[PDB]
């Protein structure tokens, strides 16, 4: 009955707290201090989580979930019925852990080297080349080089990874791993919904794409850019051409209206990584939201240490399932791109602190997209010229179009990429894309969604999806697509809460108490209620909608339509079979 169900949830919740705290600190101590000792501790905590998930998952399955009157109780048990990888037989479980470990390790130490020269790492070296170099062959060197070293070597583990992750999902009642990932959104019409949202943002992306293609035509020469074909993938200022903000200098509509180089101003005025997180902390507290505990400043790795090498530099925010212990781990470089990211990650820390009083089972975002949305919403206001000038990082209609272009290069360009990644994966998981098709189908979708072609023809043995962190690390990517849509919905709602009128893109909700209240009640729910409720608390409506993003960029869309029409651009890539010569 109901009494035995809540007895089970109570017992699960307190045992999970203890073991989850033990896993996280083990995961931290390894990631922040790589040693044989710290690795051994991690492996012992891995099999404990598996044992605990196996034990409590088996019991959770003994309950008939629909016989239960309490929905909070119902959700918790229905979650525990899914063991994830812990559903696998011992040998297959440990082989799956080996493969993930092998894929992550291969990705992390992969280096591209000159003949007699230095061996560059992805971050920050190859990232810097992609961002700053405006020479075709150098961009190509780093682009091809990374996919040859990282991607190629992941290909030996991926088919067996797919096999095992699919098996674990079938043992948990799903048809495949993609089915399992999509279920986290509890939305049967999910596929169609994301499809429709993608269609509504199409004309906005096509207009940006056409405009940027022309600018690249001007810089890289008519013999290297087809004005009716896909753009070569290595030219967008980013390794994965997922975000195009680094080529602002190439596309800025009015260099006639100049602005400060933000990275220059930051290094000059004595900005430290420590100080970038203080600034992000201040922005949250100005809204009346929770400050970070003192333990955060003591225990966080906000920059790489010098006492001893061997650390993982990837940016990440950590919940320790303690209620008191929350940390960020990042090898932050002092620049605008890392100042924005700092606000994003503090957004995760805020979310952790808000739902900390809930049982650990419900200590998550309303859906995986909600979690990444918080932090991005605030950063929108941080990104505004009004706020950046107040940070001494900047100095009128022409300035306005400039800013909107900069935000389009960040936000609009990402839309097709975030959609693209899991469109590929779901088809890999369901078996419509096989290991002979891996790379061809990746580039089919790169062309179809993004209008990109490879700069160099790909060969058998190439596994370019494996050059993107989230692939060998097995982190679902559709969360970011949902994130980018709903963050403009939140923005729109928080700005009218703050009583802001006029163009939505000018809104800066800094120090807005009413706006802080909205997010606070939404984040307090955690995973306890279906996400349409938290969506309704913030926006008034329960749906994901593209309208707010479309409303935000309306002035830029109008401007691009006008500009593309007069220059005689064909929108899209009609000559879609074109590749470089």
């Amino acid at each position: 009955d109901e009494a035995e169900a809540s007895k089970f949830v109570e017992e699960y919740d307190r045992t999970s707290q203890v073991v989850w705290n033990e896993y996280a600190e083990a995961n931290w101590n390894y990631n922040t201090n790589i040693t044989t000792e710290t690795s051994k501790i991690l492996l012992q905590k891995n099999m404990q989580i598996a044992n605990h998930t196996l034990k409590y998952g088996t019991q959770a399955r003994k309950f008939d979930v629909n016989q239960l009157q309490n929905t909070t109780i119902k959700r918790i048990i229905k979650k525990v019925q899914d063991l994830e990888r812990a559903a696998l037989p011992a040998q297959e479980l440990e082989e799956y852990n080996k493969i993930l470990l092998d894929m992550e390790t291969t990705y992390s130490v992969a280096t591209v080297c000159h003949p007699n020269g230095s061996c560059l790492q992805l971050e920050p070296d190859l990232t810097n080349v992609m961002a700053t170099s405006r020479k075709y062959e150098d961009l190509l060197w780093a682009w091809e080089g990374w996919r040859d070293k990282a991607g190629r070597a992941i290909l030996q583990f991926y088919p067996k990874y797919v096999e095992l992750i699919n098996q674990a999902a079938r043992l948990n009642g799903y048809v495949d791993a993609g089915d399992s990932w999509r279920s986290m959104y509890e939305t049967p019409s999910l596929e169609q919904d994301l499809e429709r949202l993608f269609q509504e943002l199409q004309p906005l992306y096509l207009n940006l794409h056409a405009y940027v293609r022309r600018a690249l035509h001007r810089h890289y020469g008519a013999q290297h850019i087809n004005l009716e074909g896909p753009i070569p993938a290595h030219l967008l200022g980013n390794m994965w051409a997922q975000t195009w903000s680094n080529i602002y200098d190439l596309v800025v509509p009015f260099p006639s209206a100049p602005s400060m180089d933000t990275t220059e101003a930051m290094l000059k005025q004595g900005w430290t990584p420590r100080r970038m997180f203080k600034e992000a902390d201040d922005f949250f507290t100005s809204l009346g939201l929770l400050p970070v505990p003192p333990e955060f400043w003591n225990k966080s790795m906000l920059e790489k240490p010098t006492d001893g090498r061997e650390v993982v530099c990837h940016a990440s925010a950590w919940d320790f399932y303690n209620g008191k212990d929350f940390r960020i781990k990042q090898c932050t470089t002092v620049n605008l791109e890392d100042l924005v990211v700092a606000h994003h990650e503090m957004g995760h820390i805020q979310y952790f602190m808000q739902y900390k009083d809930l049982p650990v089972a419900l200590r998550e975002g309303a859906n995986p997209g909600f979690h990444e949305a918080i932090g991005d919403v605030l950063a929108l206001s941080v990104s505004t010229p009004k706020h950046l000038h107040s940070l001494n990082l900047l100095s009128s209609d022409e300035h306005d179009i400039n800013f909107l272009m900069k935000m389009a290069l960040d936000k609009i360009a990402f839309i097709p990429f975030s959609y693209l990644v899991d469109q590929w994966r779901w088809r890999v998981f369901d078996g419509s894309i096989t290991k002979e098709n891996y790379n061809q189908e990746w580039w089919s979708l790169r062309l179809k969604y993004q209008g990109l072609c490879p700069p160099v023809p790909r060969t058998q043995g190439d596994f370019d999806p494996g050059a993107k962190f989230h692939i060998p690390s097995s982190v679902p990517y559709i969360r970011y697509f949902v994130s980018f849509i709903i963050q403009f919905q939140f923005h729109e709602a928080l700005c009218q809460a703050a009583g802001h009128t006029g163009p939505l893109h000018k809104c800066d909700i800094y120090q807005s108490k009413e706006a802080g209240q909205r997010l606070a009640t939404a984040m307090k729910l955690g995973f306890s209620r279906p996400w349409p409720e938290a969506m309704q608390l913030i926006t008034g409506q329960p749906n994901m909608s593209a309208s707010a993003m479309l409303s935000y960029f309306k002035p830029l869309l109008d401007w691009l339509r006008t500009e593309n029409e007069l220059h005689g651009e064909k929108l899209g890539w009609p000559q879609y079979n074109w590749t470089p010569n």
Binding site: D82, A86, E372
Partner: peptide
């Protein structure tokens, strides 16, 4: 999904 939610990472 019974495992502890991994640390959150950027896109």
């Amino acid at each position: 999904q019974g495992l502890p939610p991994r640390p959150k990472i950027p896109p």
